[PDB]
Amino acid sequence: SLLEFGKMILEETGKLAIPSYSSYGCYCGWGGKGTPKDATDRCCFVHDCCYGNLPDCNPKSDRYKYKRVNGAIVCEKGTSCENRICECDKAAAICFRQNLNTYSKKYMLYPDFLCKGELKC
Ligand SMILES: CC(=O)Nc1ccc(O)cc1
């Protein structure tokens, strides 16, 4: 669910999901198109593609369980959807951590006309 993705992100990066990652670039937050602006935005793009592989799952509202084995994120067993949603979110959180160095404030609240492009998952 969206509440635990928020908490996973905070734990990984030290930044609050809202607003750091809810209006970033073209795909972080609320995103539908264009070319991802930078690495962090590519993380959001991949995250969206990952959810897109689960048409009969409800990522925003379905809750999963996970634990931290010394920093490593371990998804605990639940329903097939919960397991797969959890793996999508874990990947995104790690992707965010990996690209914190290039995170840029100029992409926050990024305008929708500047999202130009095409890209396939
Ligand atoms: C803050 C937060 O949970 N953001 C978020 C979650 C899922 C998604 O596909 C894009 C963004």
DSSP string, 39-58: HHHHHHHHHHHHHHT-TTS-
Q: What is the resolution of this structure in A?
A: 2.1
* Number of domains comprising the chain: 1
Ligand 1 nearest atom to the CA of residue 2, by list position: 3
Residue nearest to atom 7 of ligand 1 (CA): 2
Contact, 114 vs 34, CB < 8 A? yes
What angle, rounded to 10 degrees, do the helices at 80-98 and 2-13 form?
30
The angle at the Cα of 115, spanning 111 to 121, to the nearest 5 degrees, equals: 135
3-state SS assignment for residue 24: strand
CATH classification at residue 118: 1.20.90.10
- Experimental method for this entry? X-ray
C-alpha to C-alpha distances, 110 to 4, 10, 23, 46, 104, nearest whole angstrom: 25, 21, 7, 18, 11
Output the ligand 1 site: residues, CB below 6 A.
2, 5-6, 17-18, 21-22, 29, 44, 47-48, 51
Domain containing 108 equals 1-121
